[PDB]
């Protein structure tokens, strides 16, 4: 009963960001590629129409 007792405010947001970040799908596809070394093929396929 003997003390002053004043009221003041504080606010806490707690922003939740960091959901998702699920990396989705990772995708890679191989190549047959061409260098000047090259050399003998084994037969052929497709190649034009």
């Amino acid at each position: 009963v003997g003390f002053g007792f004043i009221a003041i405010t504080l606010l806490t947001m707690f922003i939740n960001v960091g959901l998702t970040l699920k990396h989705t799908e990772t995708i890679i596809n191989k190549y047959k590629n061409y260098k000047w070394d090259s050399g003998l093929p084994t037969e052929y396929a497709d190649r034009i129409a």
Binding site: N33, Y34, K35, W36, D37, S38, G39
Partner: protein
């Protein structure tokens, strides 16, 4: 005029080439010459044979030179 790519090599099956990249090089090689003498050429050594043919106007225009006649029949 000597600044051009080597454009890779056949060692065994191997790897390092550029394996079809070299066009952008291969082009420059051609693109060296056909533009190095590019707006011009050598007329004298190839400018000999033809006019052994007829006297016709035989345009040499606007580069090199053509008709030396190296033979008879009217000289063109």
């Amino acid at each position: 005029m000597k600044q051009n790519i080597n454009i890779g090599n056949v060692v065994d099956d191997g790897t390092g080439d550029y394996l079809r990249k070299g066009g952008i090089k291969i082009n420059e090689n051609f693109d060296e010459l056909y533009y190095e003498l590019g707006d011009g050429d050598v007329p004298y050594s190839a400018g000999a044979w033809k006019t052994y043919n007829a006297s016709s106007g035989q345009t040499l225009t606007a580069e090199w030179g053509k008709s030396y006649a190296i033979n008879t029949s009217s000289g063109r």
